[PDB]
Amino acid sequence: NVGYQNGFTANVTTNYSHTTDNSTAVQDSNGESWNTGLSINKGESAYIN
Amino acid sequence: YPKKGLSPLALNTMDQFSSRLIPINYDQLKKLDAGKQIKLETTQVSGNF
Numbered sequence: 524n525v526g527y528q529n530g531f532t533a534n535v536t537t538n539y540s541h542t543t544d545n546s547t548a549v550q551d552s553n554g555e556s557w558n559t560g561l562s563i564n565k566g567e568s569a570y571i572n
Numbered sequence: 573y574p575k576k577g578l579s580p581l582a583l584n585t586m587d588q589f590s591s592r593l594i595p596i597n598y599d600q601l602k603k604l605d606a607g608k609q610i611k612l613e614t615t616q617v618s619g620n621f
Contacts, residue, residue, distance in 0.1 A: 531586040 526532045574580055584591055
């Protein structure tokens with residue numbers, strides 16, 4: 524950066540950094556389910572008397 | 573003050589002691605781009621004898 528403050532000013536900054544990280548997690552689950560269903564056969568589909 | 577054969581001075585050199593430069597907007601720039609010209613004009617000097 525450059526600028527004016529009681530005359531000319533300039534500054535040049537460099538930078539570097541190194542970070543590390545580690546973590547855990549635990550996840551449960553639970554559930555239920557239902558189902559219904561039919562079937563039919565066209566041709567021989569009903570008996571009589 | 574720089575005698576005949578020497579190099580001229582400068583204005584608003586950027587140092588410890590300085591001053592902000594003189595700005596122009598667009599219409600005065602076009603007025604300078606026309607046939608008008610810039611006047612240097614001295615108010616009052618201060619000297620010795």
